[PDB]
Design a protein around this ligand. Structure first.
Ligand code: GTP
Ligand code: GTP
Ligand code: GTP
Ligand code: MG
Ligand code: MG
Ligand code: MG
Lengths: 432, 429, 432
């Protein structure tokens, strides 16, 4: 009745999806064999038997990760129809993943998407998971998003983009991939969620006391975020909320749709006690900049819009009191022309702890989605890097030989500057 | 945290360090193989400050052994309690300075200083938080004095913020093992007053006196003296590696004992000291230890404090005790020795108490006295040097190794300035 | 509804807090695990479970003491959030603890303070425990008190300062630390309690017959004093009293707010019998100068103000009779311009003996807080010492190299002289 499909590009996308579907299975009490020893109708379809399968699509050019998924514990769960594999990865080259190699299987992915869509009736939207550094990520995301937006006129489209960290990088040509893919996705993405690895590293080390965190833990956190986002659809609440509500409440202007996510509470198992976890307490934890999942201090900007999804046993009266108190603060400042920048959603289902995980089970949790102007600053940094790596025309020859024009780089930089200018200009106050 | 890097120069320094690391391993219950088999978590909680845990739960001493001759390093590698050392640490040349300070500071030192500094920087980056360095060497041998001065100069030029400790065996007044040691002693002391934070002057004369008389031993070997000095050092640092009702660290001692930057030379003293038979004929009382620490015969520096005044006094106690008792002892002893302290410093006793005793005994005490009498010592050395510089005897070795007479002139001038400052501040009212 | 938070600087502060929270747990019947097999609402917050945690903050630069606390019996009780540790102690150097090292964690301590304050609603005041000799004590006390007084305009602030003994010293530079920290705290401290180790040594040796007392016993005594001070808030009485009452009744002038504490009864367990412990008897015991916890004979000065807190089964009639008799005495002389220098408070809860302790349980106890002019003399002595150690400019170079000016020493000495002059001048009588 209300279905939403998933797409995973690149190794980051695949691992994030592993965590996400793991979490969803844990939620709806689903065995790795599709059995459950309605609720699940949104994400799981049901075969003739009592077995269920997830409406998921996995795509990559390197078959190693998909082979790991097939040989992983969640083997029997997936439908081997969707586990699309290529031959050679884009190799951190947007040109390969957007002009040369992605063409080989773009048709196959589109066909699988259409077949899944035709068997669904309450199609809500697309959850695209993909990094930015990897050429697979940028190229295939650009291609697939363009194709889908061409096909379906107006349907929800959500991305969970792994924004490259300011200093902690892994690749070398990350500015190029990021700039190209952002210039592309600026026109197609309904609403994209920036997430950085460095911020999650900081959060896990300081708050969860894990001195050496692995990618698994970051994937756990992002899966928690996604589950809390969709819990309003997947369950009932005193005040539910849909994705169209989000896009209506968080997009004052058609271009500015790049919020960031934050989650709470996050405390070690040994620290489950020693605090009562007030709704005001978790509110403060959310709004504390040390918990925001993108390396930007909001105190340098204004929250243009904020949304809070609570799950568990919550009461709107105290929630409203805490929010009103938050508004009374000074450093948390919004635009003058926006009188109220808060949307509230409540769900009765508390989150469930991941077995073998690192967090501790709680009775109330809150996810925050904030669209502010501080995030604008982040873009500038990347442009900075790009400019240097573009001043010497370094690494350009790979893309040139792959069928790309320098004018594309110039125009992408211009579009990034235009977006940053729009962000800053909206950040200003109104006359009279 | 607050890890301390140990450096040893000179043959005496190497022997002292061997015995000292033996003592440390015994205290923390560390076998010669380097594995911990102790029974008190206290040892493991602060083991990092002196050891590094390599995988398979092995422990290695954070020490550096330096010389220019292979004999001493070969001996160390030969005997037990040598395996646990990191075999790459043993930096050594082939010649040996040979009591020529110019060789140990200009020619030979310039060859191995690179490797020494490389290993030092590696150790520094290996540790979490650097507290300071403790150095072991001599002042007679050219190796010890020259290379120690060179390393101290370079390190201080690399770490102006860290604290530096030196345990320099000052040559004895009466007995002299060499012929030319006044020259190198003067030069090394010049460099020390230049670039050191505290110097624990020690003489073999006083150690021999203590071993022969107090311990009642007619045959004191170098092993016994080295064991005594090792016990002194362990007692100095044990306020860091163990809890105590009133703890101290190197920084606190440095602040307390140095009223003015030049006057930073101390003398140590240890208690109790009992023979094999004369042990159960005495009660182990805080008053007993206090009175044992304060007397001419029990000072490891050949200089009567009665001839001068105590600028500052520090005391570190080990084993359980009551603070009030120690306070009473301090007040009584300051009352009776009112003529033995500077007037312009009221309450010149710096107390600290640990909570772990020295092996099989019940309690112990270590005394660190920064007094003025030591200048007399220096005086005598200068006089020796003075005579030996009037005829410029043996000068040609240093002259042909690059040093000039102006160096000796400046060194004696600086030493005389230091002695004048000490005497003047003793006379301060 | 009425909450008051604690801060502990330096080893002295930490050990004193150990004793204090031990005593409070013994009072409210609190297990080391926050269970109690309202009253506790003032000092203990309650988690979701039946577990309670103390609103305490521990700060030090040497991690050894905090590690001992963590490995001590009271491990599970505390919240590991607040056990703030540094790397290198101030090392009896006020400059290190006030300009160089304290800056490293001052923000963290302030953040913890603010978070604790926001979860409390009846915030009463701050109980700062810190010695004076230790550079950690002086430096961090100055810094933190300045920050808190800057933040909160008018709220109660109480210190329990370990004044350095006249003759029995432990450090060497104690005059410098004491002078600097006193010059600082003169403007911020609402009300500070002088306590000396030598006086407590004397009291324990003579009255409790303990020939060799340890720091533990002194901590027990000070914990008893603090518990008796707050018993009026933590319980009901025929005539209760609040901290604002104390500050109104003991501060005739804005600068003179340095009282001293005394406690009674103090008798050995073997001497529990052989006296009936009259209210007049305990009154005499309190007013006897041999029991005052600061090395100053009040007979050399005048009591400007006195306050008596009784706990246990007491009756105001006989209390008033005993006080009136006390007034009739001669050597106990006040200022002519003050007609009555007594405040009285009564609580129904008798003190409880510390298990494994040295004292004996009683049914009535009395704490006395006296603001007199004799204490003024004490300051002079320190100045004396300082002058000598400042005449030769000894030890100055450490502070100079740490970012301090000799003019600071000169101005601190001048301010100390000004305070002593004010004390003596108020000590005089009035014209006509
Ligand atoms: N959040 C998160 N991000 C990851 C994780 N693993 C990798 N990433 C990010 O994702 C990127 C991985 O590159 P991909 O997008 O998968 O590129 P690819 O699939 O290897 O294809 P090529 O670009 O041709 O190499 C890296 O730059 C990482 O920054 C993960 O486990 N969690
Ligand atoms: N206290 C103490 N001093 C020692 C001991 N062994 C040697 N010494 C002193 O240390 C000095 C040894 O000379 P070093 O400084 O090591 O010089 P070196 O390494 O032999 O090199 P050269 O100066 O060229 O001979 C002697 O002068 C002794 O006075 C010892 O066991 N205990
Ligand atoms: N009442 C009481 N006072 C104590 C106790 N232990 C120590 N003190 C006093 O507190 C001081 C301890 O120094 P701290 O204030 O803790 O200084 P620190 O933490 O060591 O930091 P540094 O000043 O850099 O050394 C000593 O001077 C003692 O006089 C105790 O158990 N009870
Ligand atoms: Mg790839
Ligand atoms: Mg030699
Ligand atoms: Mg300290």
């Amino acid at each position: 009745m209300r279905e939403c499909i998933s797409i995973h590009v690149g190794q980051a996308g695949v691992q994030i999806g592993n965590a996400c579907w793991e979490l969803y299975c844990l939620e709806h009490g689903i065995q790795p064999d599709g059995q459950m020893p309605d609720s699940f109708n949104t994400f799981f379809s049901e075969t003739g038997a009592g077995k269920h399968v997830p409406r998921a699509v996995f795509v990559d050019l390197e078959p190693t990760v998909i082979d790991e998924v097939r040989t992983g514990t969640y083997r029997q769960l997936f439908h081997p129809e969707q586990l699309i594999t290529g031959k050679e990865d884009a190799a951190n080259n947007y040109a390969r993943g957007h002009y040369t190699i992605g063409k080989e299987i773009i048709d196959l992915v589109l066909d699988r998407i259409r077949k899944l869509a035709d068997q669904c009736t309450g199609l809500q939207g697309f959850l695209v998971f993909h990094s930015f550094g990897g050429g697979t990520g940028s190229g295939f995301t650009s291609l697939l998003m363009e194709r889908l937006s061409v096909d379906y006129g107006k349907k929800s489209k959500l991305e969970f983009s792994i924004y490259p960290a300011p200093q902690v990088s892994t690749a070398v040509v990350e500015p190029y991939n990021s700039i190209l893919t952002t210039h592309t996705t600026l026109e197609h993405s309904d609403c994209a969620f920036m997430v950085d690895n460095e911020a999650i590293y900081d959060i896990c080390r300081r708050n969860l006391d894990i001195e050496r965190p692995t990618y698994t833990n970051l994937n756990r956190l992002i899966s928690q975020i996604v589950s809390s986002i969709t819990a309003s659809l997947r369950f009932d609440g005193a005040l539910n909320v849909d994705l169209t509500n989000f896009q209506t409440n968080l997009v004052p202007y058609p271009r500015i749709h790049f919020p960031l996510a934050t989650y709470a509470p996050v405390i070690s198992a040994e620290k489950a006690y020693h605090e009562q976890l007030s709704v005001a307490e978790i509110t403060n934890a959310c709004f504390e900049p040390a918990n925001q999942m993108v390396k930007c201090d909001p105190r340098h900007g204004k929250y243009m819009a904020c949304c809070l999804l609570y799950r568990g046993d919550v009461v709107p009266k105290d929630v409203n009191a805490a929010i009103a108190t938050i508004k009374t603060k000074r450093s948390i400042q919004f635009v003058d022309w926006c009188p109220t920048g808060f949307k509230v959603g409540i769900n009765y289902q508390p989150p469930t702890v991941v077995p073998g995980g690192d967090l501790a089970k709680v009775q109330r949790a809150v996810c925050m989605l904030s669209n502010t102007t501080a995030i604008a600053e982040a873009w500038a940094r990347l442009d900075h890097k790009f400019d240097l790596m573009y001043a010497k025309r370094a690494f350009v020859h790979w893309y040139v030989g792959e069928g790309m024009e320098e004018g594309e780089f110039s125009e992408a930089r211009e579009d990034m500057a235009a977006l940053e200018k729009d962000y800053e200009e909206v950040g200003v106050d109104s006359v009279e | 945290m607050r890890e301390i890097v140990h450096i040893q120069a000179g043959q005496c320094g190497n022997q002292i360090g061997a015995k000292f690391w033996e003592v440390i391993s015994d205290e923390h219950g560390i076998d010669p193989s380097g594995n911990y088999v102790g029974d008190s978590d206290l040892q493991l909680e602060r083991i990092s400050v002196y050891y590094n845990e390599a995988s398979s739960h092995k422990y290695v001493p954070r020490a550096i052994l330096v010389d220019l001759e292979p004999g001493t390093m070969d001996s160390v590698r030969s005997g037990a309690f040598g395996h646990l050392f990191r075999p790459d640490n043993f930096i050594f040349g082939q010649s040996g300075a040979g009591n020529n300070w110019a060789k140990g500071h200009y020619t030979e030192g310039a060859e191995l200083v690179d490797s020494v500094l490389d290993v030092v920087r590696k150790e520094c980056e290996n540790c979490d938080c650097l507290q300071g360095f403790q150095l072991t060497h001599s002042l007679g041998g050219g190796t010890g004095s020259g290379m120690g001065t060179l390393l101290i100069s370079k390190v201080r030029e690399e770490y102006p913020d860290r604290i530096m400790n030196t345990f320099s065996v000052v040559p004895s007044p009466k007995v002299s093992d060499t012929v030319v040691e006044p020259y190198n002693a003067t030069l090394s002391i010049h460099q020390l007053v230049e670039n050191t934070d505290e110097t624990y002057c020690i003489d073999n004369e006083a150690l021999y006196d203590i071993c022969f008389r107090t311990l009642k031993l007619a045959t004191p070997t170098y092993g016994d003296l080295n064991h005594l000095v090792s016990a002194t050092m362990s007692g100095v640092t044990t306020s860091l590696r163990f809890p105590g009702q009133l703890n101290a660290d190197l920084r606190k001692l440095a602040v307390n004992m140095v009223p003015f930057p030049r006057l930073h030379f101390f003398m140590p003293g240890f208690a109790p000291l009992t023979a094999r038979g004369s042990q159960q004929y005495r009660a182990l009382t805080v008053p007993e230890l206090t009175q044992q620490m304060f007397d001419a015969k029990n000072m490891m520096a050949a200089c009567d404090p009665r001839h001068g005044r105590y600028l500052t006094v520090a005391t570190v106690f080990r084993g359980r005790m009551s603070m009030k008792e120690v306070d009473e002892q301090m007040l009584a002893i300051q009352s009776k020795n009112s003529s033995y302290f500077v007037e312009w410093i009221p309450n010149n006793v710096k107390v600290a108490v640990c909570d772990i005793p020295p092996r099989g005994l019940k309690m112990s005490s270590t005394f660190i006295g920064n007094s003025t009498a030591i200048q007399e010592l220096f005086k005598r050395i200068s006089e020796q040097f003075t005579a030996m510089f009037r005829r410029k005897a043996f000068l040609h070795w240093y002259t042909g190794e690059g040093m000039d007479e102006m160096e000796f002139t400046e060194a004696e001038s600086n030493m005389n300035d230091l002695v004048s400052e000490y005497q003047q501040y003793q006379d301060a009212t």
